[PDB]
């Protein structure tokens, strides 16, 4: 099952995508890991696992709230 639950009703996916773009292109492009992300993490319901790993890296600048938003968008839209 997914480690990211369904978005709150009325979730702003457009704003969430902007936050993904800001947070997940700083150290590497999201594009450079996109295929791997989909097969290894999204397909296996482990989106939160990888987002939290990235958050824990030095200089990630990812807050707990950012991680929630980013996980929802990656899980539902990426
Ligand atoms: C602080 C720098 C940094 C930020 C910000 C960052 N990453 Fe990473 N990312 C890394 C490093 C370093 C690696 C290579 C080591 C590894 O695989 O964990 C990596 C690798 C990855 C991988 C490949 C993991 C694998 O199994 O090979 C994925 C997917 C990924 N990042 C997704 C993301 C997403 C999604 C975000 C935004 C939440 C993000 N990254 C933000 C540093 C960062
Ligand atoms: Na680059």
Swiss-Prot record:
Heme binds at residues 24, 27-28, 54. It is found in: Cell inner membrane. Binds 1 heme group per subunit. Monoheme cytochrome which is the immediate electron donor to P840 of the photosynthetic reaction center complex. Monomer. Component of the photosynthetic reaction center composed of protein subunits PscA, PscC, PscB and PscD. The reaction center interacts with FmoA (which forms the Fenna-Matthews-Olson (FMO) complex). The reaction center/FmoA complex has two PscA subunits, one PscB and one PscD subunit, probably two FmoA complexes and at least one PscC subunit. This is Cytochrome c. It comes from Chlorobaculum tepidum (strain ATCC 49652 / DSM 12025 / NBRC 103806 / TLS).
């Amino acid at each position: 099952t997914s480690d990211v639950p369904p978005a709150p009703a009325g979730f702003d996916f457009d704003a969430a995508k902007k936050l993904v773009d800001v947070r997940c292109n700083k150290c590497h492009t999201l594009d450079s890991v996109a295929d791997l992300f989909r097969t290894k993490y999204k397909k296996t319901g482990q989106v939160n696992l990888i987002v939290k790993r990235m958050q824990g890296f030095p200089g990630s600048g990812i807050s707990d709230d950012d991680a929630k938003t980013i996980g929802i968008w990656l899980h539902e839209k990426f």
